[PDB]
Design a protein around this ligand. Structure first.
Ligand SMILES: [K+]
Ligand SMILES: [K+]
Ligand SMILES: [K+]
Ligand SMILES: [K+]
Ligand SMILES: [K+]
Ligand SMILES: [K+]
Ligand SMILES: [K+]
Ligand SMILES: [K+]
Ligand SMILES: [Mg+2]
Ligand SMILES: [Mg+2]
Ligand SMILES: [Mg+2]
Ligand SMILES: [Mg+2]
Ligand SMILES: [Mg+2]
Ligand SMILES: [Mg+2]
Ligand SMILES: [Mg+2]
Ligand SMILES: [Mg+2]
Ligand SMILES: [Mg+2]
Ligand SMILES: [Mg+2]
Ligand SMILES: [Mg+2]
Ligand SMILES: [Mg+2]
Ligand SMILES: [Mg+2]
Ligand SMILES: [Mg+2]
Ligand SMILES: [Mg+2]
Ligand SMILES: [Mg+2]
Ligand SMILES: [Mg+2]
Ligand SMILES: [Mg+2]
Ligand SMILES: [Mg+2]
Ligand SMILES: [Mg+2]
Ligand SMILES: [Mg+2]
Ligand SMILES: [Mg+2]
Ligand SMILES: [Mg+2]
Ligand SMILES: [Mg+2]
Ligand SMILES: [Mg+2]
Ligand SMILES: [Mg+2]
Ligand SMILES: [Mg+2]
Ligand SMILES: [Mg+2]
Ligand SMILES: [Mg+2]
Ligand SMILES: [Mg+2]
Ligand SMILES: [Mg+2]
Ligand SMILES: [Mg+2]
Ligand SMILES: [Mg+2]
Ligand code: NA
Ligand code: NA
Ligand code: NA
Lengths: 128, 151, 114, 50, 104
RNA sequence: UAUAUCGGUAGGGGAGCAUUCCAGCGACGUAGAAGGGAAAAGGGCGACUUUUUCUGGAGUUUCUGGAAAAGCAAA
RNA sequence: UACCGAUGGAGUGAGGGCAUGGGUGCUAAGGUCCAUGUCCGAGAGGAGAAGAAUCCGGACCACCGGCUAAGGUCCCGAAA
RNA sequence: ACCGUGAGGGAAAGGUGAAAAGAACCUCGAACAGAGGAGUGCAAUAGACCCUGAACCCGUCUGCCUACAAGCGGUAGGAGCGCCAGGUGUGACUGCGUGCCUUUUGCAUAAUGAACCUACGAGUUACUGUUUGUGGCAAGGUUAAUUGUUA
């Protein structure tokens, strides 16, 4: 019964969090983290505009992740969000599994190429 | 557990007893006066002296242009410095310092007798040096200290 | 039989690494670097346990010197007079009286002021 | 005594000497061999009558 | 009123009801009574008595609370670099806890 | 009980801790084993040892004796 | 206070500085070869600004007690 | 598998759950790309690379400190601030301090060696001598190969 009780406690706790996750995005965690630091702490509609018009490639996926998080908030609160009500309360970028590749170099040498992936997590909340 | 139960107390910023004192340099030798001034700034005349706290007095020196240098040291003592460029060593004298102003000579001497750290860099800022007898430090009521009384 | 002490071998390192918390950079957690740093610190601690006694005696002497000069004497003259009169109060107690009980320090000085 | 409290006579069994296992034992590092030369090497043997 | 008294080779400033830690006293039990002569100075709230051959007729009476208290563990490390010599030991100083009951 | 002694490289001597398995004797475990995280306490001294809690979800351990694939910081 | 017998286990057999007596060298060398002591080697602590063997001194552990050594007592820096 | 003309050399790679009950259906999104739910299940932070899930390495949040300061990064003192009843985090400021190993007469050495972590890695066994601790018998001590019974 121990693990059942622990799981029930965690399941009750998750009901008050409003978040979305992107897992195994096949792109550089550092370059993704630049975008994350740009939009951390910002009101959601301005963040959507910023991500739509940003000059980084990763902003396109961050925008859809943010839309998913807002939808999760709307479903868990059983109402539509108003104007300027929600803001990006948490965002993080972690590194994920790396694909290893080999690239030929002069004089018969071979060098390793790393194709990196990341995870992104976004929590939204109200500006209370 | 703390098993000492009889400890030596360190003074701190709240419990230090700093005072403003005025000393006269009418006929004193430069190094001999500056050694005692350095003791005053450091706080070695305080029973609650604490080496890691600024616990000494604020010293106002008056009649600083009447300080005395014995021998031929007014022009014969050669101070050397370097600009950091090749061929960049420069010479100067206590006379050059005093012409620039008494406070520059006094600061140059007292630094050198102060500790060489952050505390000494702060402590040197508690020294005020004036050529005449006219200084504006009212509302602090500096007490007059006879420099010859200190040994 | 085959014996590999995996858990004990790892536990030794973990116990020592709990002691290197607070160090700078790799010196807190990288193990060869951390274990190197911790032993040099232990040699320092052995030396500094000896040096602490000298430091505190010097501090007491400086405070006694200042209080004696306030009373009119110097440290060397005051201590010579106390030793001649046979007063056995040590420098720690004398410095404590000088800092915190000036009347008691004054009475002590007045005892040997003759 | 039974099988649960067996005890050899005092001083009858002694632990073996184990070298090359750290500084506190007094037998690590060069492991009782000194520093260099023929006698320090693996496979050294004394030529009898030499 | 406070006094300066030598307890176990250490000079302490004591008052009534002060709960000292002193160097270990052997062969005592909790609640036992211990007297301490060798008073060097008596401050009777304004009047100061200084004793060169001790202050005559003064003492401090104490009660043992804890006959054995161990201090914090200290690591004792010896090492000589490039020589292989290294050793590490533990030390705990032993104390007795006393309470001052009367000051004479 | 006193006195004396207790810096150490090569190196000699003494006494111990942990690890895997075995015999005998005791024990523990789904009302929570081992392992992993955190915290506290202990040891002439130390190698190390206990205890509390979270994770974990099935095995573990005390003492006496026995046997070793019996301990890493640099090759 | 541990010198010899007999037995079990060794390591070492590249030494170095200083003082003294010498050879060699140029009465050169932080040179080299012997002798007699000593220290570093294998030795921490104090003074000398900082120094393997110069001056003082041989570290069982702890102490926020005291006396001294060499060397010091105007300030950095303990004490006239 | 891969490498080599060939003879030949020669890897890495185990674990969902008791049972597939292996997630109907909803939401964001072009898309399961991925996730949030619902449902199954003791448990899904057991969701297919699936038991446990350490280090190095990489992040986010909270507390404290930090833009006049200079050397192996610690160690011994010591305010202020912050948490939870004498504990715990940080550390203004002060004293002292040229890593470690190896090789050397002598190494901070500008001599050697290591990117880091986890895992792996080096006085073992047999026989025959010898000395010794502890034992059994004792003017004697001891069986080897092998044989019998039940095993
Ligand atoms: K070694
Ligand atoms: K096991
Ligand atoms: K020689
Ligand atoms: K599972
Ligand atoms: K299972
Ligand atoms: K993990
Ligand atoms: K520091
Ligand atoms: K080289
Ligand atoms: Mg890519
Ligand atoms: Mg673009
Ligand atoms: Mg080619
Ligand atoms: Mg001393
Ligand atoms: Mg040895
Ligand atoms: Mg040899
Ligand atoms: Mg070697
Ligand atoms: Mg050799
Ligand atoms: Mg070979
Ligand atoms: Mg000794
Ligand atoms: Mg020894
Ligand atoms: Mg549990
Ligand atoms: Mg092994
Ligand atoms: Mg290992
Ligand atoms: Mg030879
Ligand atoms: Mg030779
Ligand atoms: Mg020579
Ligand atoms: Mg050698
Ligand atoms: Mg010697
Ligand atoms: Mg003296
Ligand atoms: Mg001084
Ligand atoms: Mg696609
Ligand atoms: Mg889990
Ligand atoms: Mg798992
Ligand atoms: Mg400046
Ligand atoms: Mg600043
Ligand atoms: Mg050489
Ligand atoms: Mg050196
Ligand atoms: Mg070489
Ligand atoms: Mg290298
Ligand atoms: Mg190196
Ligand atoms: Mg290494
Ligand atoms: Mg390695
Ligand atoms: Na031994
Ligand atoms: Na799903
Ligand atoms: Na390398």
């Amino acid at each position: 019964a121990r693990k059942h009780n622990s799981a029930e406690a965690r399941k009750e706790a998750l009901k008050q969090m409003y978040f979305a996750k992107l897992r195994n995005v096949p792109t550089s965690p550092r370059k993704m983290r630049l975008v994350a630091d740009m939009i951390r702490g910002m009101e959601v509609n301005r963040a959507l505009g910023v991500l739509k018009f940003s000059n980084k490639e990763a902003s396109a996926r961050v925008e859809k992740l943010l839309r998913s998080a807002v939808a999760n908030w709307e479903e868990k609160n059983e109402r539509k969000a108003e104007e300027g009500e929600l803001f990006v309360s948490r965002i993080c970028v972690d590194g994920a599994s790396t694909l290893k590749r080999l690239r030929p170099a002069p004089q018969g040498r071979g060098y390793r190429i790393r194709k990196r992936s990341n995870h992104v997590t976004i929590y939204v909340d109200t500006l209370n | 557990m703390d098993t000492l139960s009889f400890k030596t107390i360190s003074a701190n910023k709240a419990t230090v007893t700093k005072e403003w004192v005025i000393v006269d340099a009418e006929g004193q030798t430069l190094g001999r006066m500056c050694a005692k001034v350095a003791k005053l700034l450091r706080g070695k005349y305080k029973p609650n002296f604490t080496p890691h706290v600024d616990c000494g007095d604020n010293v106002i020196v008056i009649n600083a242009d009447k300080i005395v240098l014995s021998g031929n040291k007014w022009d014969g003592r050669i101070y050397l410095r370097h600009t950091g460029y090749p061929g960049g060593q420069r010479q100067f004298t206590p006379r050059d310092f005093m012409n620039k102003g008494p406070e520059y000579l006094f600061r140059k001497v007292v630094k050198g007798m102060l500790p060489k750290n952050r505390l000494g860099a702060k402590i040197i800022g508690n020294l005020y040096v004036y050529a005449g007898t006219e200084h504006k430090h009212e509302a602090q009521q500096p007490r007059q200290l006879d420099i010859n009384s200190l040994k | 039989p085959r014996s590999v002490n995996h858990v004990a071998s790892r536990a030794k390192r973990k116990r020592i690494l709990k002691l290197t918390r607070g160090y700078f950079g790799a010196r807190k957690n990288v193990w060869t670097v951390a274990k190197n740093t911790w032993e040099k610190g232990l040699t320092y601690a052995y030396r500094d346990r000896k040096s602490k006694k000298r430091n505190f005696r010097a501090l007491w002497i400086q405070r006694i010197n200042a209080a004696a000069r306030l009373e009119g004497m110097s440290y060397s003259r005051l201590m010579g007079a106390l030793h001649a009169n046979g007063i056995e109060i040590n420098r720690k107690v004398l410095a404590d009286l000088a800092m915190n009980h000036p009347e008691a320090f004054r009475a002590i000085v007045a005892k040997v002021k003759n | 005594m039974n099988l649960s409290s067996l005890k050899p006579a005092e001083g009858a069994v002694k632990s073996r000497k184990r070298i090359g296992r750290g500084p506190g034992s007094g037998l690590g590092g060069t492991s009782t061999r000194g520093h260099k030369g023929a006698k320090s090497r693996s496979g050294y043997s004394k030529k009898i009558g030499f | 009123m406070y006094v300066i008294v030598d307890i176990q080779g250490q000079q302490m400033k004591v008052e009534q009801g002060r709960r000292l830690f002193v160097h270990h006293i052997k062969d005592v039990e909790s609640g036992a009574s211990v007297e301490f002569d060798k008073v060097l100075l008596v401050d009777n709230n304004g009047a100061i008595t200084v004793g060169s051959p001790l202050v005559e007729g003064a003492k401090v009476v104490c009660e043992v609370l804890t006959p054995l208290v161990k201090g914090d563990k200290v690591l004792i490390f010896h090492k000589k670099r490039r020589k292989g010599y290294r050793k590490l030991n533990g030390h705990r100083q032993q104390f007795t806890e006393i309470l001052v009951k009367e000051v004479v």
